[PDB]
Design an enzyme around this catalytic site. Structure first.
Site, short mmCIF file in Angstrom:
data_model
loop_
_atom_site.label_atom_id
_atom_site.label_comp_id
_atom_site.label_asym_id
_atom_site.label_seq_id
_atom_site.Cartn_x
_atom_site.Cartn_y
_atom_site.Cartn_z
N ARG B 63 43.49 88.56 39.73
CA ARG B 63 44.52 87.78 40.42
C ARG B 63 44.78 88.22 41.88
NH1 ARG B 63 49.74 88.10 36.81
NH2 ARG B 63 48.38 89.13 35.33
N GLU B 100 47.82 99.26 27.95
CA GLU B 100 48.69 99.44 26.80
C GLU B 100 47.87 100.05 25.67
OE1 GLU B 100 50.48 95.85 25.45
OE2 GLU B 100 51.74 96.81 23.97
O1 PRP Z 1 51.57 97.06 38.12
P1 PRP Z 1 50.71 97.14 36.82
O2 PRP Z 1 51.57 97.48 35.59
O3 PRP Z 1 49.35 97.89 36.83
O4 PRP Z 1 50.42 95.57 36.52
C1 PRP Z 1 50.12 94.64 37.62
C2 PRP Z 1 48.67 94.20 37.49
O5 PRP Z 1 48.41 93.61 36.21
C3 PRP Z 1 47.85 92.29 36.29
O6 PRP Z 1 46.42 92.41 36.10
P2 PRP Z 1 45.31 92.02 34.78
O7 PRP Z 1 44.15 93.08 34.61
O8 PRP Z 1 45.95 91.51 33.44
O9 PRP Z 1 44.45 90.69 35.00
P3 PRP Z 1 44.04 89.86 36.26
O10 PRP Z 1 44.48 90.45 37.62
O11 PRP Z 1 42.54 89.83 35.97
O12 PRP Z 1 44.56 88.50 35.92
C4 PRP Z 1 48.27 91.86 37.74
O13 PRP Z 1 47.44 90.95 38.39
C5 PRP Z 1 48.25 93.18 38.54
O14 PRP Z 1 46.93 93.56 38.96
MG MG Z 2 45.48 92.11 38.33
#
Ligand code: PRP
Ligand code: MG
Ligand code: PRP
Ligand code: MG
Ligand code: NA
Ligand code: NA
Lengths: 179, 178
Positions: B63, B100
């Site tokens: 993202r 997690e």
């Molecule tokens: O501050 P934190 O607790 O580390 O969480 C925030 C992060 O988690 C999510 O990523 P995710 O790997 O689910 O997937 P994406 O970015 O691929 O959608 C989001 O985009 C951030 O990168």
């Molecule tokens: Mg992410």
């Protein structure tokens, strides 16, 4: 303008023996880190579709995000990701496709495409075409029209361009390589 | 611009019971699909750093690619992805961090950051800060300077803002949910 297509093509590195011995990988990250080449590439794609009547851009996770989303911004229309499974929070549908060593799925949000949408699909790279064929099924199941798919790089020897052409999709690529 | 931040904030959908029962999820995809909200978020981020002297933008897969790369394009600097393992083809280094249910890694190309680079990190969402702390370690190991990290959404109750502030990172978030 050749100036520009040439500067874009030169900016992309070729890595030998990746992912395995014998094989060349065209590395788009070297374009990403050259802000002239990167902006030119988004400028060319968005100018080519400026009068196309596109109302949504779809980009497939993950490298396709880096081209589809800037094009959507340049066109001023919505961007819709198609993602790997388990990542999109609202209601989705799914399509399965073939990897080299088994199978995976792509998902899209059902709310994000609707009948009458005219959808441009954008990816960094067109190879065998398995990724976009799956993405285009997602879009059409929700009543979107896709007649255009755009790419930074085409490897026409892997068959993807011919395969998507056969499914009603006009493929547009900035550069191509072969062996 | 208060007017604009509210438009951005209201464009983001709240999803109940995701990923599980009791929990709320802020869904940035509804912002991506509103071109007005999307272009505005990129305008605020890039204008905030316009005079910062940034030479590189890093965005973490997946993202963060959606906000780091357009920010790089607006600043006119190169974009450098930090990726999930096995996706980057040139020499990489790696950093392990906690999910997690176990442990994963983020990689970066070693040639894409050098000493004296001034590196903005951009991500969609700051929750616990784990992801960005790992990212930052990648960049600093290559001689890169990181003093700023930027987000669309902050969830400060989950502690990431404070965690990263402790690590010399100034956190800038467009909106907050509590
Ligand atoms: O501050 P934190 O607790 O580390 O969480 C925030 C992060 O988690 C999510 O990523 P995710 O790997 O689910 O997937 P994406 O970015 O691929 O959608 C989001 O985009 C951030 O990168
Ligand atoms: Mg992410
Ligand atoms: O035309 P095809 O043979 O389907 O190949 C092209 C696709 O493959 C690559 O994606 P990949 O899943 O390797 O990874 P990424 O986008 O997550 O980096 C590329 O980004 C295209 O999406
Ligand atoms: Mg891909
Ligand atoms: Na729909
Ligand atoms: Na380096």
């Amino acid at each position: 303008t050749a100036q520009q297509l040439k500067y874009i093509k030169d900016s992309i590195k070729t890595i030998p023996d990746y992912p395995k011995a014998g094989i060349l990988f065209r590395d788009v990250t070297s374009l990403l880190e050259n802000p002239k080449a990167y902006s030119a590439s988004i400028e060319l794609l968005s100018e080519h579709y400026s009068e196309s009547g596109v109302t949504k851009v779809v980009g497939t996770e993950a490298r396709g995000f880096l081209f589809g989303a800037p094009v959507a911004l340049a066109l001023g229309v919505g961007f819709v990701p198609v993602r790997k499974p388990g990542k999109l929070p609202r209601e989705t549908i799914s399509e399965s496709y073939e990897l080299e060593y088994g199978t995976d799925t792509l998902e899209i949000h059902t709310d994000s495409i609707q009948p009458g949408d005219k959808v441009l699909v954008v990816d960094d790279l067109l190879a065998t075409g398995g990724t976009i064929e799956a993405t285009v099924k997602l879009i059409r199941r929700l009543g979107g029209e896709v007649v255009h798919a755009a790419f930074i790089i085409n490897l026409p020897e892997l068959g993807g361009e011919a395969r998507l052409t056969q499914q009603g999709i006009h493929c547009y690529s900035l550069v191509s390589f072969d062996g």
